[PDB]
Amino acid sequence: MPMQMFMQVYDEIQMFLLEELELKFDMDPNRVRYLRKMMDTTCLGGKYNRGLTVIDVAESLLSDGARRKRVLHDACVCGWMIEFLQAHYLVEDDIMDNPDVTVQCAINDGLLLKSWTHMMAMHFFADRPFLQDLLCRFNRVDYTTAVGQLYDVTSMFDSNDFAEFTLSNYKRIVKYKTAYYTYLLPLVMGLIVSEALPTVDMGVTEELAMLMGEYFQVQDDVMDCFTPPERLGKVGTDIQDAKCSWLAVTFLAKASSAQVAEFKANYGSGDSEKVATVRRLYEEADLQGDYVAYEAAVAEQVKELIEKLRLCSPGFAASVETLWGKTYK
Amino acid sequence: MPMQMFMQVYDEIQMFLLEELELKFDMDPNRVRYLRKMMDTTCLGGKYNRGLTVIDVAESLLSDGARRKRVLHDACVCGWMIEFLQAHYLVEDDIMDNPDVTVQCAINDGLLLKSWTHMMAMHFFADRPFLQDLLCRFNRVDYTTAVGQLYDVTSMFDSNDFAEFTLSNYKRIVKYKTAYYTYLLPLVMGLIVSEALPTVDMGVTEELAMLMGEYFQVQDDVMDCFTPPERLGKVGTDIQDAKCSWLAVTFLAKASSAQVAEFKANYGSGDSEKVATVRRLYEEADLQGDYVAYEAAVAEQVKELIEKLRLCSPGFAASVETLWGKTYK
Numbered sequence: 140m141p142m143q144m145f146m147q148v149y150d151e152i153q154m155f156l157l158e159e160l161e162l163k164f165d166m167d168p169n170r171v172r173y174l175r176k177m178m179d180t181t182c183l184g185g186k187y188n189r190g191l192t193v194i195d196v197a198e199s200l201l202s203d204g205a206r207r208k209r210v211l212h213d214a215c216v217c218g219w220m221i222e223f224l225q226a227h228y229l230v231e232d233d234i235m236d237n238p239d240v241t242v243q244c245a246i247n248d249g250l251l252l253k254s255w256t257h258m259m260a261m262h263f264f265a266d267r268p269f270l271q272d273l274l275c276r277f278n279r280v281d282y283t284t285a286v287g288q289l290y291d292v293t294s295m296f297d298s299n300d301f302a303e304f305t306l307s308n309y310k311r312i313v314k315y316k317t318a319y320y321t322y323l324l325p326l327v328m329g330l331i332v333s334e335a336l337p338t339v340d341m342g343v344t345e346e347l348a349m350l351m352g353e354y355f356q357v358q359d360d361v362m363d364c365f366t367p368p369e370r371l372g373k374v375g376t377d378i379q380d381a382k383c384s385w386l387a388v389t390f391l392a393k394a395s396s397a398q399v400a401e402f403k404a405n406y407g408s409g410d411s412e413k414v415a416t417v418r419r420l421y422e423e424a425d426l427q428g429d430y431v432a433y434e435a436a437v438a439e440q441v442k443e444l445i446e447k448l449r450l451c452s453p454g455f456a457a458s459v460e461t462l463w464g465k466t467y468k
Numbered sequence: 469m470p471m472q473m474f475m476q477v478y479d480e481i482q483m484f485l486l487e488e489l490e491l492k493f494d495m496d497p498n499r500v501r502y503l504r505k506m507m508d509t510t511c512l513g514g515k516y517n518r519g520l521t522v523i524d525v526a527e528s529l530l531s532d533g534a535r536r537k538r539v540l541h542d543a544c545v546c547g548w549m550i551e552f553l554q555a556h557y558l559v560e561d562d563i564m565d566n567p568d569v570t571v572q573c574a575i576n577d578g579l580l581l582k583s584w585t586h587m588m589a590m591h592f593f594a595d596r597p598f599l600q601d602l603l604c605r606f607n608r609v610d611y612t613t614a615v616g617q618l619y620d621v622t623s624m625f626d627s628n629d630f631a632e633f634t635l636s637n638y639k640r641i642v643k644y645k646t647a648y649y650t651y652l653l654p655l656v657m658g659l660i661v662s663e664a665l666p667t668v669d670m671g672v673t674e675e676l677a678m679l680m681g682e683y684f685q686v687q688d689d690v691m692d693c694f695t696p697p698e699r700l701g702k703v704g705t706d707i708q709d710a711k712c713s714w715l716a717v718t719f720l721a722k723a724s725s726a727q728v729a730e731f732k733a734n735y736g737s738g739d740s741e742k743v744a745t746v747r748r749l750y751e752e753a754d755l756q757g758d759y760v761a762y763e764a765a766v767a768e769q770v771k772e773l774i775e776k777l778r779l780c781s782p783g784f785a786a787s788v789e790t791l792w793g794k795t796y797k
């Protein structure tokens with residue numbers, strides 16, 4: 140039922156958006172069909188982890204028949220707002236590595252996907268008292284993500300270098316770039332639609348979102364480097380891109396002067412042998428052993444904070460538990 | 469006083485945004501100074517026609533000393549919201565024609581400039597009852613502009629060609645791509661802050677914005693083709709880019725079969741002689757003569773609609789008159 144409901148609401152949102160363009164924005168059929176296809180290509184095909192989390196939080200916060208169906212429908216629209224926001228970031232990422240009409244159309248896609256999050260909210264929640272708070276929290280999270288993208292993209296530089304290759308800075312990147320929109324926003328949106336936002340300790344929730352985000356990114360960084368492309372589903376480029384990865388920051392705290400010198404001379408290069416030298420350094424430093432322990436300690440902290448949350452918000456803690464299970468898998 | 473006030477409020481908005489990043493978003497000084505410079509580079513140096521229009525509308529809608537200073541301050545924040553929105557579109561346009569950290573930073577700039585319009589509104593208008601309506605009208609205008617950009621960029625194609633080279637389609641492009649954010653939005657924002665939105669006939673106002681936008685774009689299209697780069701302040705590329713320009717649509721309605729064939733074989737090419745052949749065709753078709761008459765007829769329509777607006781909204785009509793004078797110049 141969650142996925143079937145989420146897909147039914149997608150059809151409803153899509154039809155509203157496309158009919159609105161046709162009827163109110165003077166759009167010709169050819170462009171309407173082009174936007175239908177673009178929306179499908181960018182918004183469908185994923186696991187819908189962010190979107191489905193909104194639904195799971197709302198269902199749990201049942202602790203009137205008209206109120207239930209409304210809360211679940213609202214959870215679905217909120218879920219598609221995040222899925223469209225994710226679709227917008229991925230398009231922006233695709234421009235970041237690609238009279239060129241394809242580049243013009245990609246920038247346009249980026250702008251429409253973001254505008255669509257506002258359009259679907261302004262319509263489906265038009266009479267809801269939470270509309271203003273929802274829009275403000277969503278916009279603030281969107282800004283946070285762009286800020287996180289700045290921290291990430293400039294980690295190996297000085298915007299106006301391994302100085303920012305620290306665990307505390309790695310955590311700042313993860314929090315802003317990933318954790319706020321991937322873990323915190325779905326949880327918060329599920330709380331907003333349920334009208335149960337002040338009934339939860341936001342501090343413990345924020346802390347949980349940051350911890351789950353960190354667990355996910357450390358695993359993502361390790362997989363980027365060691366999981367082969369056929370198993371990973373993409374080509375891992377963190378070494379070549381000189382990313383501030385969990386592997387790089389952990390390696391620098393335990394490598395010798397000569398090993399650090401060897402790491403510095405081989406990091407951030409496309410050359411196959413330099414990338415392999417970095418992989419060799421990570422392996423020889425027993426980073427895979429340190430990976431297991433780091434993740435286990437984060438897992439212990441997550442498991443503990445859910446209990447503190449369950450003391451005042453029991454239903455919410457079970458939805459945070461399922462969100463965690465999706466990450467820990 | 470308007471420009472001095474507008475610049476004073478810029479310093480105030482900038483300081484709030486940058487202090488917020490430092491204090492609430494964990495930003496390091498190096499990145500704060502980098503964003504201060506980027507904000508200055510992208511947001512300052514223009515004529516501030518959109519921003520100053522908001523101020524001019526609010527001053528006029530004076531037909532309590534605490535209310536005046538608030539309305540004028542609000543007009544300034546709204547003006548900077550549009551100037552930042554304009555800055556965001558220009559950055560997006562710069563990406564449209566340019567491990568590349570400059571492209572990553574340009575995309576990031578685009579995203580921050582837009583997010584800043586929301587951040588400054590959410591702060592300065594936090595307790596205002598118009599905040600929700602202002603955000604919704606601004607977001608709807610932003611979407612309209614992205615839609616207009618789609619109509620523009622794909623005018624010479626079929627997104628899934630001279631069929632869309634018509635006066636009615638030219639007007640659809642101008643309305644969505646330019647008129648809504650350049651002429652309608654500054655007028656509407658000046659009305660919102662003054663709490664005088666329902667006291668005006670929106671139909672006549674929308675019609676005026678569309679007409680002024682059209683007058684401006686026809687002149688812009690003619691200047692792009694005939695005004696030399698040292699006088700224009702840029703290199704005119706409409707012919708090379710095969711734009712749906714006022715010159716192209718007017719030429720196609722009056723050219724002979726052989727001349728249309730000659731236009732079709734030479735339009736949309738970078739080759740210097742093909743561009744010159746297009747310029748020769750426009751000249752020989754007496755498009756400069758038709759330009760004068762087209763603009764004069766639009767001017768007559770503008771002058772007439774301001775009178776209808778003055779019947780119910782006198783102060784507003786004088787601000788629409790000054791906005792027109794800035795375009796007619």
Ligand SMILES: O=C(O)Cc1csc2ccc(Cl)cc12
Pocket residue numbers: 186187188189192321322462465466
């Ligand atoms: O869905 C994604 O894009 C990434 C992802 C992989 S496991 C997991 C668990 C929870 C959330 Cl919110 C996201 C993810």
Ligand SMILES: O=C(O)Cc1csc2ccc(Cl)cc12
Pocket residue numbers: 515516517518521650651791794795
């Ligand atoms: O300011 C710009 O970017 C373009 C422009 C030139 S004359 C004029 C008059 C009114 C408005 Cl709103 C804009 C313009």
